[PDB]
Design a protein around this ligand. Structure first.
Ligand SMILES: C=CC[N@H+](Cc1ccccc1C(=O)N[C@H](C)CC)Cc1ccc2c(c1C(=O)O)OC[C@H](CCC(=O)O)O2
Ligand SMILES: C=CC[N@H+](Cc1ccccc1C(=O)N[C@H](C)CC)Cc1ccc2c(c1C(=O)O)OC[C@H](CCC(=O)O)O2
Ligand SMILES: [Cl-]
Ligand SMILES: [Cl-]
Lengths: 150, 150
């Protein structure tokens, strides 16, 4: 559980926002990319795994699951690449609501930056710091610290 | 000191590697940029502060300290922007040693990627995961979790 992440790809302004969600905490990292490719996804996961102890990634679609570029990055970073089939039907709902929230926040900050990438990073910040009480940033650190003491 | 970070700029292959070091743990995040500008630095700090609870940044030089772009990002993200004067002379030595280590790791992986940015992310991964025994990635989580319980 401490090491499980889910990939999520959403669209805004003709661009693609790639999101990784730490499933247990709801903490996120995100980036804006021109299009989802294997190379973009592979690079994103490499960054993520250097920053948090990523054990398992539930990939966002079959193309990223298949991609030998993505598989090579997961091999390098010691990540178990898994499908993202929503065996628990609540998964679809949670991701959809997260995408909606993120787009809402992006609109609220959209005027405080020229470029979408900036607005997306502002949205990451607001999402991770929002107390709902603890924040997602607090939950992820608490979860992993609890794990390290095991 | 759970919230204290230090900026560090180093050069390789005609490009600039911007590094943020979590002082208490030695955990790092890094990116390759064409040149250090206020905009590049501001965006880097915005990303960092959305991902970790960044209270204070010791800036790497007077230009970034002065930059109104950098000050605006620090204001946005709730970061106290401070100078990076090495009042403790050991800090110069520590940063220089980190730069040398990072460049060594980049050399060791340089063949496993076409692009320097990839190699730098691999270096971040190796640095953060290396047990010295705990890793820097373990130390930062433990430090912050301890703080949250305060
Ligand atoms: C066709 C894939 C390209 N590479 C193949 C490669 C080339 C040479 C040696 C090893 C490997 C190799 O498979 N390496 C190991 C096993 C896995 C990391 C790896 C790679 C992936 C994503 C990137 C990269 C790079 C790069 O080669 O540096 O460069 C930046 C780019 C930025 C995002 C974007 O622009 O899409 O993301
Ligand atoms: C001259 C600065 C430009 N901006 C001024 C600005 C313009 C319009 C509205 C508000 C603000 C403003 O001051 N905003 C708040 C108060 C602080 C975020 C902010 C900004 C900084 C770094 C970036 C940006 C952007 C951007 O405008 O989106 O875009 C991506 C770029 C990528 C790194 C690179 O390419 O150097 O880093
Ligand atoms: Cl946070
Ligand atoms: Cl780690």
């Amino acid at each position: 559980s401490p090491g499980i992440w889910q990939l999520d790809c959403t669209h805004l302004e003709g661009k693609v926002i790639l999101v990784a969600v730490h499933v247990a905490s709801g903490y996120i990292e995100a980036e804006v990319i021109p299009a989802e490719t294997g190379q973009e996804t592979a690079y994103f996961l490499l960054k993520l795994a250097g920053r948090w102890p990523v054990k398992t990634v539930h990939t966002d679609n079959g193309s990223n699951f298949t991609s030998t570029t993505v598989k090579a990055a997961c091999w390098w970073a010691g990540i178990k690449q898994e499908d993202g089939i929503p065996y628990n039907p609540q998964s679809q709902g949670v991701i959809e609501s997260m995408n909606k929230e993120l787009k809402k926040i992006i609109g609220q900050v959209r005027d405080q930056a020229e470029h979408l990438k900036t607005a997306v990073q502002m949205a990451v910040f607001i999402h991770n710091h929002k107390r709902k009480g603890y924040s997602a940033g607090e939950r992820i650190v608490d979860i992993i610290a609890t794990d390290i003491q095991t």
